[PDB]
Amino acid sequence: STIEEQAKTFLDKFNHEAEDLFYQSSLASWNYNTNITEENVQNMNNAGDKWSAFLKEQSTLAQMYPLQEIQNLTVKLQLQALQQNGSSVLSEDKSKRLNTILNTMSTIYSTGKVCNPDNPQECLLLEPGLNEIMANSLDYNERLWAWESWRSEVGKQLRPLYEEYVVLKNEMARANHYEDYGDYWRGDYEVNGVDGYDYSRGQLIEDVEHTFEEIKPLYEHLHAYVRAKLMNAYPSYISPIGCLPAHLLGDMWGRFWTNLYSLTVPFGQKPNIDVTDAMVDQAWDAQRIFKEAEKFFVSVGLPNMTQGFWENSMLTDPGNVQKAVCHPTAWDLGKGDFRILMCTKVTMDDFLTAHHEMGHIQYDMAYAAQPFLLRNGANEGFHEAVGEIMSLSAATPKHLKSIGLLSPDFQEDNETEINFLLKQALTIVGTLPFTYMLEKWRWMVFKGEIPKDQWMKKWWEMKREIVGVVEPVPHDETYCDPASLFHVSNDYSFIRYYTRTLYQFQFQEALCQAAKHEGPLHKCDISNSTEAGQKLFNMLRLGKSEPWTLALENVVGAKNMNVRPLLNYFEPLFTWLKDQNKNSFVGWSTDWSPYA
Template sequence: MDAFKGATVLMLFAFFTRYACCDEYFRMGVNTNSAEALQFLREYDREASGMCYRVTISQWKFVTNITEYNRRRMLEELALSSKFERLSWRKAAAYDASRLPDPQGRRQLMRVVQASRAALPDDKFTEIQQLITEMKEIYNTAKICPYGQKPYDPHIPKMLSNQDFMTNQYQLASNPYQHYQPHQENTEYPNYCDMQLDPEISRILAHSRIESELLYVWKSFREQTGPKLKNRFMRYVQLANQAAVATGFRDAGDQMRTAYDDPSFRTSAEEVYNQVAPLYKQLFTYVRRRLVQRYGEASVRGDGPIPAHLLGNMWAQNWKSIMDLVMPFPQAPNVDITAEMLRQGFTPLRMFQMAEEFYTSLGLKPVPPEFWRGSMLVRPPQRSVQCTASAWDFCNRIDYRIKQCTEVTMQDLISTHHEMAHIQYYLQYAEQPQLFRDGANPAFHEAVANAASLSVYNLQHLQRLGLYQNKTHDPYEVSMNFLMSMALEKVAYLPFAFMVDQWRWSVFEDGVENMNNRWWQMKLRYQGVIPPMPRTESDFDPGSKYHVISDQEYIKYFLATILEFQIFEHLCLASGHTGHLHECDIYRSRDAGRLLSEIMQPGASKPASEIIRTMTKGKTNKISPDSLVRYFRPLELWLRVQNRDEPLIGWSSNYHDVALFAPQRGSGSSNTARVGILAALICLTL
């Protein structure tokens, strides 16, 4: 390994020496030698693939065996990768891409230049990387005390036995909607202040129906993240903007949006959101009434916004955990095949084999042998690992892996198919240059993986697999329960996924003043959600969302959720499906597989608009929400009936709502009037 590392360093040194010499390379578009530019791209492809492999393997070793040694090795590789990125950017930025006769070469050069922050001076480039690393570490190590307990007392030694712990876990898995019981002040649990977001805090928010406990964990997690992150984030904003301006953009938000090849991207995204907002408001209105029934008008106003801690999720972005409160037909089942999987003796390996067979039944590629040898499909014993499910491309056209601590549950079966879809995407575009081994735009990878998962969720598909039989319940009631569950996951997510980057772009454009106030303004405007307690600028609630502080754009998740239904509908059309979209199963359809392959094979070598045009047979080249609306049409009709007596579809805000987060700079009538005007403006946008 050391010999290999030494050879790699020498190779990179030669590459850097040849292509990074003088200040002239900081000037954009000076070099018009197209032959030299193409030679650079050929050499970049080879070197970037090797660097990508080294970084990815070091990251894999760390997350599958978390030790200090593996962490140091990973940081070493990341540092070397940063140097490679900077020096590659300098060379690419020196060329006039418009003079290249090859459009693919132009596209590759622009991808090297546009997404990087390498235009910063060395010290500032290092600083922004360090800031992001520090913010991630603060976030990932945030811990809170259990509800109702004092800090750690070493005189409370009693722990649950392993058998009791496993029994509790099995009961939770078999009945996910049972009420989570808060810790009591007794000796049954040690009061360690070591509760992390995943799984303890998330589990409480999902399963507790005790409002004081929900408020406690919501507040405590934000106290352990936002205030510690705020100053670092403000400096990050400053540096990100400097990098963007030096690269030729107006600000860092403008630089982020360039990946979508759409000069009117913000307007296009807003138009898409406006088309799905009526469906969201119908869902919101129905859910609010059920929450009023559960918690009372003192907690949830009948025509107002919903307090954020009552929706089953730290950020109120996914409402699926409150399905027990809003199920349309409680006497009919909410489909969960976990018990049947256990009865049939499913194992994690069998789940992955089933996922592979799903894609090969479409005529797609089987995974290579390296996948089965290298993947981490279950939690390994006696070592610390990071369990978040993810698919990995090791950039060598051979090695692809999945990391997932799989358990035999329906949710993990869906996750397995989702991650296997990413692997299929890697396999389909494997022959593309390194710069094109990615989705057509940042939304495509998630959209394709979710589109395939929509078929696996499907009741017809589960019946074909022998995992679900409905012999006693009304099919309409079962279908409405299914669609409600999907809407709580997909439709409820849309306004949150849309507003995160609306807020981030506003910070890049307008500065860091009143960041927290603007965050809650947008949550109220788009989600109809308010904080459950007063917030000030010292709180920095956006810092409670990992993607904000880890420098990961978020609008792609909004577009991916829209696009997944658009892709799914066209796969269903290719398969010959007729009837309701939510009843479509593309399993074993070679025609659907061919279309899916056509979507994936180009990778990022073509603009997303071209791939969408091909997928839709020329009908459109834009991401459209029409398919999502059609998918949920039966549920929307049902919701309209349920909401027919509601005085307001959506929400109205008043002075008290806005006063929870509006900056209090004055006092008396002038301050009341200012907050009242803000409330009125927010109402006008609903």
């Protein structure tokens, strides 16, 4: 005769009903990503529509349960997630603007174009055409054209479309009793109902901004150093007194600076830590690449892979007729079914991705005992940062010499570590100001205190301020170049990548102290330590059943998002950069100097 016992009856009915329907949708989506046919698109959409319509019926039934008398917290979190109306609050004439616009964003982003205007020779897709022109060429004139080949040919048709997207998704928040749509994405980090552990939605803006004042002195010396080793290839094209061009930061958007490692190598005389030539001498294949990743995990203490994974997943590119995309993603089909979807190669990156994508699987079976609604990460940043802490350990020289990929006699001097740390700094430190600036721009445009004619002049002025990038060509308000990125056009919360770094190094210092490593964090290893494995597995098995702020206290003891155990990873690099930047102009102001 209590509402508490009535909710537990309904959630017991929903858990068995949803996991049958979720497995059918995941199996249909798995076959779409391996064997593309004309009917397979319809086959995936048939199962995915009835699964989405199933959640529409269950959300209406759970609405009539009052939330003011459920003292149990395990079922309170399930009812809060199940009762999210989403698109049900909007009318039929407004719900049709969701699927029309969102499918238009995916089709527009799928159009690859590098054909020159008034010179129509040929042009390929994004992966063979767009990535080679930003990562390999060193010509300023054509890369500026390539910068305008996508931000003026693809993003120009999004300005009436993306603004229509941000005026109706913003209206959903008042119908869902949120502040704005930017506040809706902060509900994943929101914690309520626990005394002393509650996380306000507005606390995320303050905590991200509070952690940015220690990211900045590391980024001041990184941007100052990289602006001196980039002007060598472009002598009279960039001034070493201001900021950097946008079309010279590795990718089209400058998110990852991995392609600047060859141009800005600290000490290239000694050979880099590269075992790509080493695996072809020992005849490594797709099976042996993932086999050593599995024995790495069982040495830590995590359980090994099941027998329904090696003979069930795909490893290489299969057949000739199968033109399916094999971007490296982790699959959690449920009911004990776990798969990895990638095309294996004998390279440095694919071996590390084999360790990286396996970590999401090891996180996935950890919360297998949890109910279906709580069968997820603690937030959007946990499931990505857990899959990357093993990527930091597998790239260490100690782990590479343990298996035998690296040479048995490889000395570790100063320059053998600055070369490795700066490669990690371009892919980790360099993506932090770009992630914070873009999400700060998206939060205010979802808040609405940015007018239509003030989108671009505010977006560009924080890129010059926070990131420190001078515009290679002036752009007026009719351009919509911030919406060209993959995550922003497809409705992906980009704040999970800023908190990915601050989580993946909080766990790294916590696990290295558990393994009792004597040395700095860059040479640290996680394997052969069951004490560190038991510390991690206790927080992995919680899932979303516990608040994320309690998950930090189970590993690091600090309930907040700590930024201190990330500078300690880069102390050997930062002290060298402080000595290297004695005469360089470190610290940029606002700079209209090169393109006034």
